[PDB]
């Protein structure tokens, strides 16, 4: 069988919990998950290679001193702008971001028109043509790749619901909490933290 | 629609994207969430202008004990609310002349108790029409128009209620308060400055 | 003139509030109520039996130690545990626990066959085939008495929720709060603690 | 899909490593590994309950005496003992078994002889007292049966593996396991060479 974990994908079936009324929440969900997919790698993958939770990985980079993000990233000998010019700047960083992000969800939800030629239409959360340079789509069974990415897309959007919840009680960060639970399964869990009062009781 | 240029749709107007209308009784319960929604914002808006006292503290001014303190608040007032000399506007007083008013006024409002009336004010519309609107603005304007007018105003102000109590439980500070500190200086007073200070808990 | 409150029942009549939902919602309501039900009829006895919170009541059975609930109920003509070998031990009680209580809801909702094969049909609201051995209200207006049972639910329900939060709020218990409250309502309140501040502010 | 385990089960299919052609170790199998589970689980069942190895367990007793299991087992009312006497029970632990031994397999008369043929490893006509036999269908709780009958049995011979390997028990040897998997392990008890090297 396909899908046999929990309910159904929006392709096929029906929500055993949500009446699944609003067919704009299928889409909605693949962004939604690729999203959360792309978040929770970073936070997996920034507290291993730098050692600061993704909830405070913020405060590096702020209108004044944005040098603090400059050479965080694993290997990358070279910084992100060189050291003493002071150019990692929070306007800046957040000005490309707003264009080129602005850019990409316009062409991607029919603000502005799209700058190619080759069909891509608007609203289809996947395309295809002109994102698959490997051609791994037609390969490969199309329908089976959309569930696994469906499965990855849930997964990961509860994966950051986790980690945020946990961001909350722990006020540690992701990663130290999956070692500290490793290290000590029973002495590290919510219903420990609960012991302690979660931090604040 | 060509009028509602707003992200969301009026009852009526078409279908929302997410949470589409369901029962009609949903729309009646906007209109009169924001109507009151509105009425809070301005008051809370006001009161701390005035004197200077966020509204999520000005309750306790008034306690079954001793409820002087609401007493010349208003700024401007030619006299004392109540006798200067043993001011009388206490908690239970106010309590059982308001509970009395509104009490009367919801009923009469929603029709469960008979109107006083009876001047053909049909309870359950929104837009009641009578003495409601001795001014008749609606007569002379344009209805729906008017209509979808009090719609982005009734979702404004309760966004903007949302607002006011997010911003009291994160900074406890007052909504003008949190105003005049962002005018002061935006880009180093804003949510994400408070962020990285905790919230006044982390 | 059945039901005459705010509401109205799942078989007649439609939810003022929310839409109704599903049939899933109509039977899964019910079982939430009974769940209800028994935790707050837990919480309030615990309470006054033991006089510590239900929520921190959690902390007494640990995996390194449960031998704090070994005397904990009153009136007990002796400790359940022998009080010198501590043989709970939480790990007994957890096993035990989850295998009775996975099996039941196993039999409840057929994720496994019912053992008992007397005709009960799964998922049924009330199935009262042999869940109703006194019989006193399976004769004579069964209708009523599950209208009965149905408002004891939502009751039920709302009172945990409320027992959550307000512990949330307060953090001593429910039937402290409630001593608190009765005592001196006007001096001891929800707007009173809100004033002085729930825990915070 | 039964028994997608690797090999196949006696009744059909030839397995995949020992051919045969006597139904006399099937029949053998089920019964090796039905004793198997009963000694495995009294395993776990003793070793916590009292807190020693099955090994010692055996040399607990002596041909002289046997009173160390009075007031042994876990929440006992009473012990066992008010003769704690190893040939006092030996010998009727020895008549009682051997008794068993020979109504299951036809040495001497069944005590009930309600048809059930000694050949038969499934007489449920007098067996399954629950009569879970009827109440589900029969072939698939074969099945089940002697999955189970060949995984007790493979953790007997493990269990008693590493009895003679770690001499710590195969639930300290669990604890042992779960406390610090990476550093304790066949191969770590292998590095300090299991006692003998
Ligand atoms: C040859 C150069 C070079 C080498 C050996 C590494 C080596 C590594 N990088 Mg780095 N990186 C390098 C260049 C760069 N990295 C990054 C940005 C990153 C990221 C974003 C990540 C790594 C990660 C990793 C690890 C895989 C490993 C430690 C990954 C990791 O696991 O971090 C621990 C990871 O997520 N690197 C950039 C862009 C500025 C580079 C440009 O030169
Ligand atoms: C001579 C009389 C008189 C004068 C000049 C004022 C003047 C003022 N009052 Mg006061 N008031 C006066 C009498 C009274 N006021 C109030 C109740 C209020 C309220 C409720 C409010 C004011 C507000 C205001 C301010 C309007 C600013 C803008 O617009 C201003 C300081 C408003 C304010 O705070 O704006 C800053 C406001 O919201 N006054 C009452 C009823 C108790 C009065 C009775 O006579
Ligand atoms: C629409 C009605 C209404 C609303 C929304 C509020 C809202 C509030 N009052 Mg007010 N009041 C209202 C009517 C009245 N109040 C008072 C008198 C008081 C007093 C005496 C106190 C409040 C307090 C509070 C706060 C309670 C916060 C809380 O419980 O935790 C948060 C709850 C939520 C987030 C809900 C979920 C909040 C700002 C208390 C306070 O904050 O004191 C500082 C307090 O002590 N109010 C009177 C009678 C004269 C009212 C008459 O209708
Ligand atoms: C008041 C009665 C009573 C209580 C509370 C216990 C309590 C216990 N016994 Mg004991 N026993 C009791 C009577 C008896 N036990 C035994 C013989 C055993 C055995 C053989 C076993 C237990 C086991 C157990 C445990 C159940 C598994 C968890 C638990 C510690 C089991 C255990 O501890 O396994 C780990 C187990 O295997 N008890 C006998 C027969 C002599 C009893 C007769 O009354
Ligand atoms: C109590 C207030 C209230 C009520 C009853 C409604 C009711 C309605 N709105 Mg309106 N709306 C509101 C507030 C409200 N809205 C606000 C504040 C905004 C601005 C963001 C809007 C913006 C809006 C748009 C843009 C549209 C609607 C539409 C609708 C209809 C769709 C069905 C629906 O969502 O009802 C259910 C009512 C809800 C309020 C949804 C629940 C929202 C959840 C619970 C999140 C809220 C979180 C909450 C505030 C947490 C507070 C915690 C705090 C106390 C600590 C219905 C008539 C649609 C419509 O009519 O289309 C034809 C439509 O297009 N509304
Ligand atoms: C005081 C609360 C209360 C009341 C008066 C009833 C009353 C009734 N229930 Mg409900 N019920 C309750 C609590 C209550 N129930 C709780 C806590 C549980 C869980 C243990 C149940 C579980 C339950 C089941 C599982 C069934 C009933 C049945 C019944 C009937 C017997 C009667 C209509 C039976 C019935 O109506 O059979 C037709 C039936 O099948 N109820
Ligand atoms: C039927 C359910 C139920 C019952 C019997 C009670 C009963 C009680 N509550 Mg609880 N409570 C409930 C629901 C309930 N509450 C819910 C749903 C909430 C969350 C909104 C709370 C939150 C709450 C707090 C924070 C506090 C209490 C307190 C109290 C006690 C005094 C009443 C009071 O001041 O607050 C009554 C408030 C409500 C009933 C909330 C009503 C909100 C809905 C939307 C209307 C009393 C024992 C207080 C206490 O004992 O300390 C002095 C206290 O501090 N309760
Ligand atoms: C995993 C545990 C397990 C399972 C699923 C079964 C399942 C079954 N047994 Mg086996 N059995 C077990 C443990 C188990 N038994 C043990 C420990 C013993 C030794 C006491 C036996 C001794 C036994 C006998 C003596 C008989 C069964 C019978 C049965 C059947 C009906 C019950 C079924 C094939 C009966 C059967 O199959 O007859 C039709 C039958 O006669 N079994
Ligand atoms: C039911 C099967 C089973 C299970 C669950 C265990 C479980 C365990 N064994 Mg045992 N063991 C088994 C079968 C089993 N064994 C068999 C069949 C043998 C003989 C080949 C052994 C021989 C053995 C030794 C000699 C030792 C263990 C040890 C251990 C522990 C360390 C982790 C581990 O499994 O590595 C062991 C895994 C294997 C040996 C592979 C199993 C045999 C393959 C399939 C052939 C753990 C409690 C060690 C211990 O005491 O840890 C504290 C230890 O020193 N085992
Ligand atoms: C990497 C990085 C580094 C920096 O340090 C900081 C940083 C913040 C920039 C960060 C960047 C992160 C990014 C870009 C994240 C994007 C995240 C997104 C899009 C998250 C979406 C999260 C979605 C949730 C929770 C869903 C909850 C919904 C639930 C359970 C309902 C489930 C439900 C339904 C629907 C139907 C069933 O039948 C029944 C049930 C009831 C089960």
Redesign the interface.
Same mark, same amino acid.
């Given at each position: 069988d396909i899908y046999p974990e929990f309910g159904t994908y929006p392709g096929g079936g029906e929500s /055993?919990?949500i009446?699944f009324?609003?067919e704009?929440?299928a889409e909605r969900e693949v962004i939604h998950g690729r999203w959360a997919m792309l978040g929770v790698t970073g936070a997996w993958a920034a507290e291993n290679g730098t050692g600061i939770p993704w909830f405070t990985a913020?405060?590096l980079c702020? /209108?004044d001193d944005c040098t603090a993000v400059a050479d965080k990233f694993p290997g990358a000998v070279a910084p992100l702008a060189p050291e003493g010019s002071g150019y990692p700047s929070f306007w800046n960083v957040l000005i490309i971001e707003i264009v080129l992000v602005g850019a990409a969800e316009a062409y991607r939800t029919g603000i502005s028109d799209s700058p190619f030629d080759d069909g891509l239409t608007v609203g289809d959360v996947n395309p295809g043509g002109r994102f698959d340079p490997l051609g791994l789509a037609e390969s490969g069974d199309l329908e089976e790749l959309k569930i696994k990415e469906l499965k990855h897309c849930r997964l990961s959007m509860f994966a950051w619901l986790g980690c945020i919840f946990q961001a909350l009680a722990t006020?540690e960060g992701p990663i130290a909490n999956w070692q500290s639970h490793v290290a000590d399964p029973?002495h590290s869990n919510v219903?420990t933290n609960?012991?302690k009062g979660f931090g604040?009781?």
């Open positions: /055993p919990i009446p009324g609003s704009k929440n913020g405060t702020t /209108p006020q029973v219903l609960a012991a604040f009781y």
